[PDB]
Every structure is written in C-alpha cells, then in structure tokens.
Amino acid sequence: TSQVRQNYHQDSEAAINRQINLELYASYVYLSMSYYFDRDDVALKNFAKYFLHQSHEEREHAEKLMKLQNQRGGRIFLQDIQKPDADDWESGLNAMEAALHLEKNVNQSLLELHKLATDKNDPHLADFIETHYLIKELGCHVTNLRKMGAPESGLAEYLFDKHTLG
Amino acid sequence: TSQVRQNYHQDSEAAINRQINLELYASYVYLSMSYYFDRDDVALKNFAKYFLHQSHEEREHAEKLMKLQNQRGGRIFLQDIQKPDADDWESGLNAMEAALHLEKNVNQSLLELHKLATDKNDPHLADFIETHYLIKELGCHVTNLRKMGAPESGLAEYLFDKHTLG
Amino acid sequence: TSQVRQNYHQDSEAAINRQINLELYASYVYLSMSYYFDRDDVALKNFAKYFLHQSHEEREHAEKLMKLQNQRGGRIFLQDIQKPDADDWESGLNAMEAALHLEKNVNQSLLELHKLATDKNDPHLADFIETHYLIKELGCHVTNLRKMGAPESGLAEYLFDKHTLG
Amino acid sequence: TSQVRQNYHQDSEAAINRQINLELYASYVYLSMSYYFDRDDVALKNFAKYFLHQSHEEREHAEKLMKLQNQRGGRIFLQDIQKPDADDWESGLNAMEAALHLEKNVNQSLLELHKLATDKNDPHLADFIETHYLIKELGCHVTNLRKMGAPESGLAEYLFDKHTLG
Amino acid sequence: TSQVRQNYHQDSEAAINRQINLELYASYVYLSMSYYFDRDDVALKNFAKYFLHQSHEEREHAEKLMKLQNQRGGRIFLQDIQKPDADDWESGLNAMEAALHLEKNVNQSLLELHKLATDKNDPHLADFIETHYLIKELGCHVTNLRKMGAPESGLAEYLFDKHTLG
Amino acid sequence: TSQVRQNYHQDSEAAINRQINLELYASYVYLSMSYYFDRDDVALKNFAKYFLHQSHEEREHAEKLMKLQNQRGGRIFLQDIQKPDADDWESGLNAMEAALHLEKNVNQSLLELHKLATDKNDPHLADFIETHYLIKELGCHVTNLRKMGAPESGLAEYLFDKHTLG
C-alpha cells in the first residue's frame, strides 16, 4: 504494498494477526466466565458483570489492534476463535487464577511483540503496545480470595462479591 | 437437572446453544467487514461505524441468549468461532448483500426455532425471539446501492456513506 | 419474488391486504359517523370528536399493516373502500352500537388472520398483529348510554357527551 | 330543510358532496404512492414521508369541507372511495407527475364549484375555496428531477430524496 | 352471552377463575411469610420487606386477571382463599425454598392455561401470560443462602439480609 | 413464651387474629365488588376505582394488626379467607348498602376488641385501635343515591359516579 506502509516488516504484520486472535480469544474466555457466574447454581452476578466487563475490554484490544494494521498499512487476516479450556469454572477463586493465567500469556504475546517492534526498528510500533494491558489486579483478588475461605467459604466469596466487586 | 428448570424440553436447550454460536459468528463476520472499510485503500469510515455497530449488536443478540439459557434452567456449552468466508470483501454493495444473506440465515435458524418451540409447549421460549429478531433493512440498503451505480460508481458508495450513514 | 421474503406465505400476504380493506372501511365509517354528529341538528360535540379520533386511529392500523407488508417482502394491492351503511346515524348508542358491531368484525378477521398465522408458522407476523388492536371500551359506552336512558332521552345524550367524552 | 340553512342551493350542496369524494380519493392515492416507496426494492424514505404527508393534508382538506356542509346546514352523502389507477408508480419522477395531474384535476373542481359560488352568490362558500389550496410545488420538483437524470439515473432520484425532501 | 365477549371459551373463563384464586393464594402465603419474619424471635426486617413486596405483586397479578376476565366479558367467580401451609417458615433459607416450590406451581397453572389457549386459538388470552411473570430470582437466591451457611449459620441469613435485600 | 410479652393477654391475642381474618374478609369483599362494576354490562368506572381503594385500605388495616401482634409478643395464626356472599352485587347503593352493613361488623368487632383491652387493662392495644378505623362516610353515600332515585335510576347511578366518585 500500500501507499501507507513504510518501515513495517512482514513479521510485524503477521504478529498483529496473531495477537488480534489472542485478544479475541480472551474476550471469548471472559465471556465464557461471565455467564458461568450468572447461572443459578452459582448465582454470583458482579463476578458476572466483572468478567463481562473484562470481556468487553479485551474485545476491544483487538479492535484497536485492527486499527493498528489498517494504519500501518498491512492487511487484516482473521482466523477462527477457539472454545475455552474449561466449561464449569468451579468457583470464583478458580476463575481469577485462570483469568490470572490467561492474562499472562496474552502479555507474553506482547512482550515478544515489542521485542519484534525493536528488531525491526519500528518506533510507532515501539509504542502503543506497552500501555493498554498488564496483570496484577487479577493477582491481589487472588490473594484477597486466598486469605478468606475460598473456594470453600462460599461465604468468603459472596462477601468478596459486595465489598470488592460492587 | 438444575433447580430452576421446568417445561424446557432439553432438545431446545441444545438449540439455544446453537444461536449462541450463530449470533456470535454474525458478530465475527460483521467484525470482519467492519475493519475492511477502515482499510486505507477503501477508507469508508461510516461504512465501518455501521458494521462495527452491527457486530456489537448481534453480539448482544447472543449475550441476551446466554442469559436466556441460565434463566429457563439450561446450561451453556460454547464452541469455537470459525472465521468468516472472507478475510476481506469486495464492495459496499457486496458487503451489504453479504449481511443480507447472513441475517437471512441467522433469522432462518429462528423461524426454525419458533417451530419446535411453538410445539414442545414453551410459551416462555415462544416470546423472546418474537420480541426482537428482525433484519428487513439492509435488504432495503442493497436496493439503495444497486440503483446508484454501485458497486463500480465509486461515487455512489461515497455519497451513500455521507447520506444514508451520516 | 422479493429479496427479503421468508416464511411469508401467499395465503398470508393476500389476507393482510384483505384486512387493510377492513381497517380502512372503519376509518371511513368512524369518519362517516364523526360528521353526522357535527350536524347542527343533533350536535353531540364530543361524539364528534370521539369518532373522529377513531377514524384517525383506525387509519393508523391499516397503515401499520402497510408498513408490515412492505417489511415482510409482500406487495400491496388496495381495493375500493366501500361506503358505510346509511348516512343518518340516528342517535348515540345506536352508533356506539354500530361501532361495537363494527369492531367485532374487525376483530374476527384478525382472529382469522392469526389462526392463519400459526398454520404457516410465522412468528413475526403472529406477534405483530397480537401486540396492538382490541376493542372492549365501547362496550362500556353502549351500556352507559343504555343504562342512562338513551337514545330515548336527549338529556341522557348530552350529559354523557359532557361527562364521559371530555 | 335545516334552521341554520340560508343562501344555500341544492346544487351548492351536491356540489360539495362530490368534491369531498374527490379530495378523499386523492389521499387514497397519496397513501398508495407513499407506501410504494416504502418497499424493499425501491428504498426512498423521504419520498415515503412526502406523499404520506399530502395524504393526511388532503384527509384534512376533505374534512374541512365536511364541516362546511354541516355548518352550511348541509347533509353529507358519502360514496365509495375508488382505488387508484396505479400500484407501481413507479419511479420517483413518474410519481410527482401523476400527482401534478392529480392536483391539477382536484383544483379543476375547486374552480367549478367556486364558479358555482358566483352563480348563486354564496360568498361564504367562495371564501372557503381561496384560502389554503393548490399545486405548483409538485411542479417545481418535477422539473428538478428531470434536470437531474430521472428516471435513467437512480443516483438522481436518490440525491433528490435527500436534498429536497429531508 | 356478553356483547364484548368473543372467541372466549367456557373453559377458558372457568380456567381464569381457577388461576385468579391461585394467584390470590400466592399473595396470602407471602404475607404469612413476611410477618413471620416480623417476629421478635427471628429478626430479619429485610426478608420481611421482601415477601410483603411479593405479596403486593402477586395481588396485582391477581387484579390483572380479574380485569381481563370482565375485559373478556367473563364473569368472575371467586372462591375461598385457602391458608398457608406454614406458620413457621422457619428460617431464611427454608422460606425461599418454599417460595420457589410455590412459584413453580403457579407458573405450572400458567403454562397449562397457555396451552389451553392454543387448543382453541385465543391470542388475546395468550398475550397475557408471557409478559409479566416467572421465578429465577428466587432460585438465584436459595443458592446464595445455602453457600453462605444457611440455615446452620444465622450469621449468613443475617448477612444475606443486608447484602441482597438492602 | 415471648420476650417482648407483658400485659398482653391470650383472649386478646386470639381475638386479634380473629380480627385480622375479619379485616381480610373486608378486603376480599371490597375486591369482589370493585371488579363487579368493571363488568362490561354495568361499567361505572368510579365505583370500581373506589371499592378497589377500599379493598386496599382494609387490606392495610389487617396488616397494621400483624405488626401490632408481633410487636406485643404474639403469634399470627391466619386462616382461610371465606368468600363474599353473592358474586353479582346488584347495583350502586346495594353494594354501598352492603358496604356500610359490612363496616358495622368490623367496627362492632373492634368495639368488642376494645372492651377486652380495658377489662385486661391494656393501654397500648386500647390506644392503637381507637385511633384508626371508623365508618360513616359510606353512610352519606347510600343516602345521596337513594335521594337521586338509585338504583331505580341508572341515570341517578352514573352521575353520582361522575360528580362524587370523581
């Protein structure tokens, strides 16, 4: 090629295709986590709308990644989206850790992306990718869930529902 | 099975899972066709902001099914989300006619859903596709693009962009 | 054929149109009666403003069906609007008795429509019609008037005009 | 017849009960013309707002007359309202021009009744005619389309649908 | 038959009189359930607001039918209103669970009233069922109390008394 | 048992409960009647919106007794709510006539409840009752109607609706 591209590598153009999927995955996942806490033998809305909100949130990420190609110049190639690993997320504490673990791999994907954003001397790519993500909050809640009665306390969670997910 | 269920001939619960996927696909394909029209060798923002905005709405077509599952008593099984057929489309009219067939499909599996539902005695289920699943539109856009010299008269597309999307 | 026709059967399409020549007949009837009461020599000034609104808000049914046909892919085939029965409407209940009578045939045709709307298994049709038009109220005007002494008492007349229809 | 009747010929009235039958027909035609442009294969919204609007405005045009009758101590004698004429109208251009002829006709009948007003010195009858009626505006559209590429250039009666009817 | 009665079976009516009396019983229980908690030896003001609030809504649900009955031209025939069933209800958990078993009952008598409608095609009757009824909320409640410790844990049905009924 | 019991006797307690089932019988009776006038073949809308109110504010007396009961340490032992005599309520005053005739037996009971409150020298019960429920208003209405010629003058009926019940 287009009249726009310049200093943009074919590798870099493939990676975003890769992330565009991975971030789309996470939306699928959190989506999957969101309605598990909406079903009655769990009944933990808030946990619901928390994950639905992280689901809408990574549902973007991509959507801004797709802007990043239709702007650096590349072409967006979309691949299927995968069903999640589980289907009964056991509990609040389990979920978060899973979310906890899902958000690392997502970020690992980017950490090597900037490592590709430097090896191909793309500063307009050596930006934008470093500041829209990151974990740790999803840590914490783990500690906040660990030290309580989770995932036993069912009581330790219905309280975590109000005073940290309200 | 669970505690809320009653008068929910499982057979339909299976199908509920299938719209979930279906409508998701819709939201995928519309996601596709949305960020092609942001491509710089197309640059048709409004066409984007339209498809970008049909994707979000057929997504919540599905979000507002996974709520119907839990509710009537069911259980939500997700599956992979397959890519669209392209992977990057042809023209506004081509995109338009596209959704047309697509929404005709996603509507086909619902009038195929009223039946089975309009039989297995689920007055509940009978009144949540009856309240808000409808396409007509598009079909009436298709017309507005053909008659104007689309999909070649690029001037037709660009004027359609500012007047029936602005 | 039409590009958005789907599950829309021809028996249906032709019976809609047969219903539009009813819903424009009453409008003409309610119009016919609205201005028998604007006559200087009975001059029930509300019964005039009442049946007027009725002819108005029963030319809106027939319109909403025209919005419907055109939305289901159909084609519209209007016919002559016959003229009501008789030009002198006598009095008050007798026209209220007329308007009752008239509403009931309009109801019975829609019941012949919906009964036809579940033979071809149309969800969209059968949900559109049933969410709108009924009747009763006039039932409680014929009574009142028959209960007060109408129509044969002129003081009964004017009072209901001035205390029910204001 | 009547006590209020005065200076009103037979003759004048009958000449009112046939201009009502006319103004009525015109709305029935404007209806037929407005919903023609509400189809899925025509797709002109502002055309469908226009004639529907003249539809009501002639509805009223016929009503004022009605009251004129009773005010004149007349007796309205309603006849059947005839269908069009046309179902396909069938382009933008070919519609107004059939309304122009439609409007040049109804006005032709105004003038005769008014000459009937001067042949009976019915001045309260004349001043009803020369207040809020007549054509032209259709004309200046008719020219506008032709000058634009109708009916050969759908892009014409499109851009006329938004630039003079929005 | 009655003048407004049309397309209404005996049979449908006498069913309404057996669904009225039922929604009626549905309120009485809630009262019995509200003021149970209004005791000095049970001490949950929020539960007490919550079944007294249901008690007010099922009564409305009962008034809604009366009105349809007559509106259908039916003749309401009231019966005794039977008593609970229970005076000690006799914890938070156990109250909910009998409210769930209760709501499933009255909904059962809806679904068979609805199917009653289909076996005659009574579409005005049918739209009164699928608009403003059903449970779930009681489902999604019972779980929470269970998971928290109820009835083995007054500290739970206390805590649930604020954090989901404040 | 009880810990807030003191100077509350068991003739009292068992007479309070007896009084609630009185005051719920009134509600049921007013409710049987409100939707009597809602019948198409009487339709005195205000008679319906009044007695409907009476059935409220006499379903609210009974509730004000349960709060009292539980306050004074007691227990609530509700019973079957017997049904009103006759489903057809004749006319306007006949319903009014009954309506007084029925207040005179809730008051008569209360007056019998009070004499029990001084013979056991209760102040808090003897003050709560004498500051709430009385009668006569209806007394004036039975007269007005009988003065006008009710019920037998349907015109005396409907006016009283409009000028006194509105």
Numbering used by the authors:
A (entry chain D), B (entry chain C), C (entry chain G), D (entry chain H), E (entry chain X), F (entry chain W): 5 to 170
Question: What does the original paper state about this entry?
Answer:
It is a nearly spherical 24-subunits protein with an exterior diameter of about 12 nm and a hollow cavity of 8 nm.
To answer this question, we prepared the third NF-8 mutant termed Δ3C-∇C where cysteine residues (Cys90, Cys102, and Cys130) were replaced by alanine (Ala) while Asp144 was mutated to Cys. After E. coli cells expressing this mutant were lysed, we found that four overexpressed products occurred as shown in native PAGE, suggesting that one polypeptide can simultaneously produce four different protein species. Three of them exhibited the nearly same electrophoretic behavior as NF-8 (band 1), 16-mer∇C (band 2), and 24-merΔ3C (band 3), respectively, suggesting that they could have similar protein assemblies. Subsequently, we used these four protein assemblies to screen for their suitable crystallization conditions, respectively. However, we only found conditions which are suitable for the growth of crystals with the 24-merΔ3C-∇C and the above largest species, but not for 8-merΔ3C-∇C and 16-merΔ3C-∇C crystals.
